[PDB]
Amino acid sequence: EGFIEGSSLQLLTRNYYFNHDRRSKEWAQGFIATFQSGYTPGVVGFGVDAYGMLGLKLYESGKAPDEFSSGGAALKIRAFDTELKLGDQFLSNPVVAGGESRMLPQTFRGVSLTNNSFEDLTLTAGQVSFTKYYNDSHHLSWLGGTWGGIEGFTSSLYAAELQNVWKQYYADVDYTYEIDDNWSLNPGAHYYKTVDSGDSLLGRIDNNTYSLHFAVGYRQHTVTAVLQKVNGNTPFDYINQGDSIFLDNSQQYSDFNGPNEKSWKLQYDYDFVALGVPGLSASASYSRGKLDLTRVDPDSPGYGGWYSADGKNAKHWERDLDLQYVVQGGPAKDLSLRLRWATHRGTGGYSAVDNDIDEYRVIVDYPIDVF
Ligand SMILES: CCCCCCCCOCCOCCOCCOCCO
């Protein structure tokens, strides 16, 4: 289509409300404007992507500082189903993301390469840097791919190096079987290997983390079983934590990722579609985990504070209630409201590591398509 003709600008308005009980509320506006050029015609095309981001409480982006802002752009070059972005850009993959848990995502400065030559295969590579954000600079490079070569099944393999911190490896599989027209099974696994790298700023790291999910769908109902296991004396670690889609036990509050923590969750989801009210969904979860805090090295530079002499039998749990309505028609079409309730308690001195809390979040989201 071409630079002008293929251009699009989106503005995302974000209302964000966060309530915390401890055994502090917060209100914030946010705006994210996104432009994408078309491509100059020819074998090798040229374009531009650019964004700007603002938020205001009603580096530390926002939720704990009265205002925040940022903007950037990247040059894109597209040849043979390969796209190269050079500049500031968003990222989501198993070893790197701006993260979905907070109001504004983090961005990254550098090179990304994405190949779509084969339908069913995505390859990506990259080298970027980023600062520090949410709750000097970092450098990270990754190589990865995602394969779709079978009808109900998907595969991923990724690696990253976070300079002087870690090398991280990740695999996954997801299978879906449709039995009846109303009954389906979704077995799946996530795997993370983590080792220390270079100067080893966080200290020694030898960490293997597993996520198991089994999901029975029946019509609108879906019930899901999760096992998660962290093997090593530091907790599973990743950039921009919370609500991770590469972990089956990542929850509103806790990631159930502590060192040597075994965990499970039972989740229930419902789609109100056939009950007459489409765009309405709800879900509830219960998660339980246990780990032995005596096994942490208290002198571990990055992770030392997980150690507790009195930890031993430490355990915690979380029960999440989640519902969201997207408005599907009229003027507010696409306006989405989402309500989030989490309760978390630990026992066995888990509280020397994390807190007993009750979290309430409300998120109002309005997309605008401007050209
Ligand atoms: C399945 C998508 C292709 C992934 C590109 C390579 C990602 C980098 O991984 C480095 C670590 O991999 C360890 C051994 O890799 C075996 C490579 O061949 C496997 C073929 O799927």
Residue numbers in the entry: 7 to 29, 36 to 70, 81 to 86, 98 to 168, 187 to 422
Manuscript excerpt for this entry:
To determine if the phylogenetic subdivision of Occ proteins exists at the structural level, we determined X-ray crystal structures for seven Occ family members (OccD2, OccD3, and OccK2–K6). In fact, OccD2 (formerly OpdC) is closed in the crystal structure. Interestingly, the closed state of the OccD2 channel observed in the crystal structure features a strong interaction between the carboxyl group of Asp294 and the side chain of the central basic ladder residue Arg389. We speculate that the carboxylate in this interaction mimics that of the substrate during transport. For example, the dominant states of OccD1 and OccD2 have very small conductance values (∼15 pS), in accordance with the small/closed pores observed in the crystal structures. Interestingly, both channels show occasional upward spikes in conductance, suggesting the occurrence of infrequent gating events that form a larger pore. Indeed, we crystallized such a closed state for OccD2. All OccD channels, with the exception of OccD4, show good levels of arginine uptake. Thus, remarkably, OccD2 and OccD3, while efficient in arginine uptake, are not uptake channels for carbapenems. OccD channels are highly specific and transport basic amino acids.
